[PDB]
Design an enzyme around this catalytic site. Structure first.
Site, PDB file in Angstrom:
ATOM      1  N   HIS A 129      -1.713  -3.011  -4.561  1.00 26.79           N
ATOM      2  CA  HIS A 129      -1.874  -1.569  -5.050  1.00 26.79           C
ATOM      3  C   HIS A 129      -2.210  -1.690  -6.696  1.00 26.79           C
ATOM      4  CE1 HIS A 129      -1.626   0.961  -1.691  1.00 26.79           C
ATOM      5  NE2 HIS A 129      -0.649   0.168  -0.922  1.00 26.79           N
ATOM      6  N   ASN A 188       1.659  -5.608  -3.584  1.00 24.82           N
ATOM      7  CA  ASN A 188       1.237  -5.046  -2.084  1.00 24.82           C
ATOM      8  C   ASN A 188       0.011  -4.618  -2.384  1.00 24.82           C
ATOM      9  OD1 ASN A 188       4.148  -3.036  -2.737  1.00 24.82           O
ATOM     10  ND2 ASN A 188       4.369  -4.656  -1.465  1.00 24.82           N
ATOM     11  N   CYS A 248      -5.783   4.998  -7.682  1.00 28.08           N
ATOM     12  CA  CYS A 248      -6.826   4.527  -7.710  1.00 28.08           C
ATOM     13  C   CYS A 248      -7.106   3.055  -7.066  1.00 28.08           C
ATOM     14  CB  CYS A 248      -7.309   3.782  -9.342  1.00 28.08           C
ATOM     15  SG  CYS A 248      -8.926   2.972  -9.426  1.00 28.08           S
TER      16      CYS A 248
HETATM   17  C1  LIG Z   1       1.972   1.417  -7.304  1.00 31.29           C
HETATM   18  N1  LIG Z   1       1.858   2.913  -6.915  1.00 31.29           N
HETATM   19  C2  LIG Z   1       1.753   3.350  -5.659  1.00 31.29           C
HETATM   20  C3  LIG Z   1       1.436   4.654  -5.405  1.00 31.29           C
HETATM   21  C4  LIG Z   1       1.024   5.132  -4.198  1.00 31.29           C
HETATM   22  C5  LIG Z   1       1.096   4.566  -3.125  1.00 31.29           C
HETATM   23  C6  LIG Z   1       1.135   4.877  -1.894  1.00 31.29           C
HETATM   24  C7  LIG Z   1       1.151   3.946  -0.759  1.00 31.29           C
HETATM   25  C8  LIG Z   1       1.532   2.542  -0.838  1.00 31.29           C
HETATM   26  C9  LIG Z   1       1.881   1.934  -2.388  1.00 31.29           C
HETATM   27  C10 LIG Z   1       1.645   2.930  -3.269  1.00 31.29           C
HETATM   28  N2  LIG Z   1       1.860   2.334  -4.591  1.00 31.29           N
END
Ligand SMILES: CNc1ccc2ccccc2n1
Ligand SMILES: CNc1ccc2ccccc2n1
EC number: 3.1.2.14
Lengths: 263, 264
Positions: free
Chosen positions: A187, A185, A222
């Protein structure tokens, strides 16, 4: 991998790879953390599930608030490790995922882990209590009686972590994620933060000690274009207090503790 | 994994993991490069090595001079990929390791790779031609007739790569390795350099194109306390780039390479 007989937990075997090991020729704690995350993903897939249910309609996801890992023996390069995982509801606070690591040849428990997850709207980033109708959707996949990887009344997984005070004893500044640090995604993968925390531990501690316990709180993420400073102070076996914060404004992203045993 | 019937090559299957994939839910080129390196290690282990007894006595090691990878289809998350690998001596110049990637379900070739290795003294870092004693010791593990992953006459794996001229079109500055980037000997893993090269490709290219070919030369290593600058210039339906990794301070070249990308 496969669900167990009662369908309430999942097991999977992994052979430790050449690039997954450190200078001791045993799996790094980041390799262990990646395997825990992989078996969690495979457990969710095996039961039809991010691990979302009708949460997709409301744009809700599960996010990690705390990760706690204890390793007694790191598996060697070429060894087979078996990991068993399961989930449990913690009322409206959120969910808990637990793991047990075993040596496949001996059947001996070589590690254990536990994590706390909260429900968050993926767009506003606002947390919310777990409502009825969403709770029921995954209660049929969890043991009903308590099953804890860390049962001991008063244990390291539930300790409050204080905020590190400036000046830090040790630091590693200017840490940035590259594309390999991102998940599907885009992230930053949760395991990268474990690596960043460990970056401020001096090399002589890593060369003479073995990491036994790590507890990490996740406050904020981050972003791909953010820069991180990793801070550590000895609090003591050797124990450390950790803090990850944004390089610019000093915004806290993580806080944690590590416990190391002399080899 | 296991050696094949004739004992002259090695095969192994891998199931693509959730953290090993990019935004398209398919294996990254760095995940592929790690699997190629893992199957090379398992092949060396299966035949008793990848230094011989003579190499360890003389403090000699094999080091990568060039890596060339071509991917037609990146395997999806949960898919099983089968990789076959083998080695061949290239006279006294060095050794070559080749790989073939296949989809386990269809049996179709989805990728291929080739690498050139030179013999170097571990301590002085001086290269040397392969002696007869060392050559004969590993020739019993290699096919005698030529077996190439890239047989074509004018193929991309043997092209000369030019040095990128300043100013670069794109750049990513201040790249540093962390402990996860190091191997068991505390040296930066060869796959980290592939990641660093790709860091200077704009996100728009990554989001609209698929990496088809990457050729990378290794000139010098980045030490644990070194800092790297990654430089890229477009040289071109298909997009091609010229790449340069150099030390942040003195501008010492560590790698040069080229990438070819096709529109999705
Ligand atoms: C991998 N970790 C995270 C932490 C916070 C998130 C918030 C929105 C979407 C994905 C997210 N992923
Ligand atoms: C991982 N790659 C390298 C490249 C050069 C080396 C030189 C001496 C020892 C190890 C080395 N490893």
């Amino acid at each position: 991998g496969s669900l167990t007989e009662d369908g309430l937990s999942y097991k999977e075997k992994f052979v430790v790879r050449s690039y997954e090991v450190g200078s001791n020729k045993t799996a790094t704690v980041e390799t262990i953390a990646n395997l825990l995350q992989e078996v969690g993903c495979n457990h969710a897939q095996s039961v039809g599930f991010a691990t979302t249910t009708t949460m997709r309609k409301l744009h809700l996801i599960w996010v990690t608030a705390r990760m706690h890992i204890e390793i007694y023996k790191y598996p060697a390069w070429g060894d087979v490790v078996e990991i068993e995982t399961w989930c449990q509801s913690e009322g409206r606070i959120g969910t808990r995922r637990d793991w047990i690591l075993k040596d496949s040849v001996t059947g001996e428990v070589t590690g254990r882990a536990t994590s706390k997850w909260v429900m968050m709207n993926q767009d506003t980033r606002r947390l919310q209590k777990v409502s009825d109708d969403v709770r029921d959707e995954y209660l049929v996949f969890c043991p009903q009686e308590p099953r804890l990887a860390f049962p001991e009344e008063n244990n390291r997984s539930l300790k409050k972590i204080p905020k590190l005070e400036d000046p830090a004893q040790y630091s590693m500044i200017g840490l940035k994620p590259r594309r390999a640090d991102l998940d599907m995604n885009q992230h930053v993968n949760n395991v990268t933060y474990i690596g960043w925390v460990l970056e401020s531990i001096p090399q002589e501690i890593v060369d003479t000690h073995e990491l036994q316990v790590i507890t990490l709180d996740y406050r904020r993420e981050c972003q791909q274009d953010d820069v991180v400073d990793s801070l550590t102070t000895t609090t003591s076996d050797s124990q450390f207090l950790h803090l990850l914060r944004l390089s610019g404004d000093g915004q806290e992203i993580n806080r944690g503790t590590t416990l190391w045993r002399k080899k």
